[PDB]
Symmetry: C7
Subunit: 25 residues, 7 copies
Protein backbone atom coordinates (compact mmCIF):
# COMPACT_ATOMS: atom_id res chain seq x y z
CA UNK A 1 0.00 0.00 0.00
CA UNK A 2 0.95 3.63 -0.56
CA UNK A 3 0.73 4.36 3.18
CA UNK A 4 2.91 1.42 4.25
CA UNK A 5 5.50 2.37 1.61
CA UNK A 6 5.61 6.01 2.78
CA UNK A 7 6.05 4.75 6.32
CA UNK A 8 8.97 2.55 5.22
CA UNK A 9 10.35 5.64 3.49
CA UNK A 10 10.16 7.34 6.87
CA UNK A 11 12.10 4.45 8.43
CA UNK A 12 14.90 4.70 5.88
CA UNK A 13 15.21 8.46 6.39
CA UNK A 14 15.60 7.83 10.13
CA UNK A 15 18.35 5.32 9.40
CA UNK A 16 19.98 7.98 7.21
CA UNK A 17 19.73 10.23 10.27
CA UNK A 18 21.31 7.48 12.35
CA UNK A 19 24.38 7.31 10.09
CA UNK A 20 24.72 11.11 10.35
CA UNK A 21 24.66 10.94 14.16
CA UNK A 22 27.22 8.16 13.68
CA UNK A 23 29.38 10.66 11.84
CA UNK A 24 30.36 12.16 15.19
CA UNK A 25 33.25 9.69 15.29
Amino acid sequence: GEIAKALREIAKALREXAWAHREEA
Copy 2:
Protein backbone atom coordinates in the same frame (compact mmCIF):
# COMPACT_ATOMS: atom_id res chain seq x y z
CA GLY B 1 -0.33 -5.82 8.98
CA GLU B 2 1.86 -4.02 6.46
CA ILE B 3 1.13 -0.71 8.18
CA ALA B 4 1.94 -2.11 11.64
CA LYS B 5 5.13 -3.72 10.33
CA ALA B 6 6.27 -0.44 8.83
CA LEU B 7 5.54 1.40 12.05
CA ARG B 8 7.73 -1.21 13.79
CA GLU B 9 10.47 -0.55 11.26
CA ILE B 10 10.31 3.09 12.25
CA ALA B 11 10.76 2.25 15.95
CA LYS B 12 13.78 0.09 15.12
CA ALA B 13 15.37 2.97 13.19
CA LEU B 14 14.77 5.25 16.13
CA ARG B 15 16.43 2.73 18.45
CA GLU B 16 19.31 2.71 15.98
CA UNK B 17 19.50 6.51 16.28
CA ALA B 18 19.64 6.05 20.05
CA TRP B 19 22.37 3.39 19.96
CA ALA B 20 24.39 5.68 17.67
CA HIS B 21 24.69 8.06 20.62
CA ARG B 22 26.94 5.75 22.62
CA GLU B 23 28.64 4.13 19.61
Copy 3:
Protein backbone atom coordinates in the same frame (compact mmCIF):
# COMPACT_ATOMS: atom_id res chain seq x y z
CA UNK C 1 -4.38 -3.27 18.31
CA UNK C 2 -1.17 -4.01 16.45
CA UNK C 3 -1.14 -0.45 15.10
CA UNK C 4 -1.53 1.07 18.57
CA UNK C 5 1.13 -1.37 19.81
CA UNK C 6 3.55 -0.32 17.09
CA UNK C 7 2.94 3.35 17.82
CA UNK C 8 3.69 2.70 21.49
CA UNK C 9 6.91 1.01 20.40
CA UNK C 10 7.81 4.19 18.56
CA UNK C 11 7.08 6.21 21.71
CA UNK C 12 9.43 3.94 23.64
CA UNK C 13 12.23 4.33 21.08
CA UNK C 14 11.99 8.10 21.44
CA UNK C 15 12.18 7.78 25.24
CA UNK C 16 15.33 5.74 24.67
CA UNK C 17 16.68 8.56 22.52
CA UNK C 18 15.84 11.08 25.23
CA UNK C 19 17.76 9.05 27.81
CA UNK C 20 20.74 8.59 25.51
CA UNK C 21 21.06 12.28 24.72
CA UNK C 22 20.62 13.04 28.41
CA UNK C 23 23.51 10.74 29.35
CA UNK C 24 25.90 11.67 26.52
CA UNK C 25 25.54 15.37 27.33
CA UNK C 26 25.84 14.66 31.07
CA UNK C 27 29.37 13.55 30.21
Copy 4:
Protein backbone atom coordinates in the same frame (compact mmCIF):
# COMPACT_ATOMS: atom_id res chain seq x y z
CA GLY D 1 -9.10 5.84 21.20
CA GLU D 2 -6.10 3.58 21.49
CA ILE D 3 -4.46 5.05 18.37
CA ALA D 4 -4.94 8.67 19.49
CA LYS D 5 -3.65 7.70 22.97
CA ALA D 6 -0.51 6.10 21.54
CA LEU D 7 0.05 9.15 19.36
CA ARG D 8 -0.07 11.36 22.45
CA GLU D 9 2.52 9.11 24.11
CA ILE D 10 4.75 9.78 21.10
CA ALA D 11 4.26 13.51 21.56
CA LYS D 12 5.22 13.27 25.24
CA ALA D 13 8.32 11.25 24.42
CA LEU D 14 9.26 14.03 21.99
CA ARG D 15 8.75 16.63 24.73
CA GLU D 16 11.06 14.51 26.90
CA UNK D 17 13.53 14.75 24.03
CA ALA D 18 13.15 18.50 24.03
CA TRP D 19 13.52 18.86 27.82
CA ALA D 20 16.71 16.79 27.67
CA HIS D 21 18.07 19.43 25.27
CA ARG D 22 16.75 22.27 27.47
CA GLU D 23 19.01 21.05 30.29
CA GLU D 24 22.04 21.04 27.98
CA ALA D 25 21.90 24.84 27.81
Copy 5:
Protein backbone atom coordinates in the same frame (compact mmCIF):
# COMPACT_ATOMS: atom_id res chain seq x y z
CA UNK E 1 -10.86 14.34 15.71
CA UNK E 2 -8.76 12.95 18.51
CA UNK E 3 -6.36 11.45 15.99
CA UNK E 4 -5.74 14.80 14.21
CA UNK E 5 -5.35 16.53 17.59
CA UNK E 6 -2.82 13.97 18.75
CA UNK E 7 -0.85 14.52 15.52
CA UNK E 8 -0.91 18.28 15.99
CA UNK E 9 0.41 17.69 19.51
CA UNK E 10 3.30 15.73 17.99
CA UNK E 11 4.04 18.62 15.61
CA UNK E 12 4.11 21.01 18.56
CA UNK E 13 6.52 18.72 20.43
CA UNK E 14 8.81 18.75 17.39
CA UNK E 15 8.70 22.54 17.23
CA UNK E 16 9.61 22.47 20.92
CA UNK E 17 12.53 20.23 20.04
CA UNK E 18 13.59 22.68 17.35
CA UNK E 19 13.70 25.53 19.87
CA UNK E 20 15.63 23.55 22.45
CA UNK E 21 18.31 22.54 19.96
CA UNK E 22 18.80 26.14 18.88
CA UNK E 23 19.28 27.17 22.49
CA UNK E 24 21.49 24.15 23.26
CA UNK E 25 23.62 25.06 20.27
CA UNK E 26 23.58 28.77 21.09
CA UNK E 27 24.81 27.77 24.53
CA UNK E 28 28.35 27.54 23.11
Copy 6:
Protein backbone atom coordinates in the same frame (compact mmCIF):
# COMPACT_ATOMS: atom_id res chain seq x y z
CA GLY F 1 -8.48 16.39 5.42
CA GLU F 2 -7.65 17.21 8.99
CA ILE F 3 -5.29 14.24 9.32
CA ALA F 4 -3.25 14.96 6.18
CA LYS F 5 -3.03 18.60 7.26
CA ALA F 6 -1.73 17.65 10.71
CA LEU F 7 0.82 15.32 9.14
CA ARG F 8 1.93 18.21 6.92
CA GLU F 9 2.31 20.22 10.11
CA ILE F 10 4.60 17.49 11.41
CA ALA F 11 6.80 17.66 8.30
CA LYS F 12 7.10 21.41 8.69
CA ALA F 13 8.21 21.11 12.32
CA LEU F 14 10.87 18.63 11.24
CA ARG F 15 12.03 21.10 8.56
CA GLU F 16 12.21 23.67 11.35
CA UNK F 17 14.35 21.11 13.22
CA ALA F 18 16.53 20.94 10.12
CA TRP F 19 16.87 24.74 9.91
CA ALA F 20 18.01 24.74 13.54
CA HIS F 21 20.95 22.57 12.47
CA ARG F 22 21.64 24.52 9.26
CA GLU F 23 22.01 27.57 11.48
CA GLU F 24 24.50 25.79 13.74
CA ALA F 25 26.99 26.27 10.89
Copy 7:
Protein backbone atom coordinates in the same frame (compact mmCIF):
# COMPACT_ATOMS: atom_id res chain seq x y z
CA UNK G 1 -3.57 9.91 -1.53
CA UNK G 2 -3.20 13.02 0.55
CA UNK G 3 -2.15 11.00 3.62
CA UNK G 4 0.53 9.01 1.77
CA UNK G 5 1.60 12.34 0.29
CA UNK G 6 1.92 13.99 3.69
CA UNK G 7 3.83 10.97 4.99
CA UNK G 8 6.29 11.31 2.08
CA UNK G 9 6.73 14.96 2.98
CA UNK G 10 7.63 13.90 6.51
CA UNK G 11 10.24 11.48 5.17
CA UNK G 12 11.76 14.24 3.04
CA UNK G 13 11.88 16.47 6.11
CA UNK G 14 13.83 13.73 7.90
CA UNK G 15 16.31 13.46 5.02
CA UNK G 16 16.63 17.25 5.19
CA UNK G 17 17.48 16.74 8.85
CA UNK G 18 20.11 14.08 8.13
CA UNK G 19 21.78 16.36 5.58
CA UNK G 20 21.92 19.31 7.97
CA UNK G 21 23.42 16.96 10.56
CA UNK G 22 26.17 15.86 8.19
CA UNK G 23 26.94 19.52 7.41
CA UNK G 24 27.13 20.00 11.18
CA UNK G 25 29.59 17.15 11.66
CA UNK G 26 31.55 18.39 8.66
CA UNK G 27 31.80 21.99 9.92
CA UNK G 28 33.98 21.00 12.88
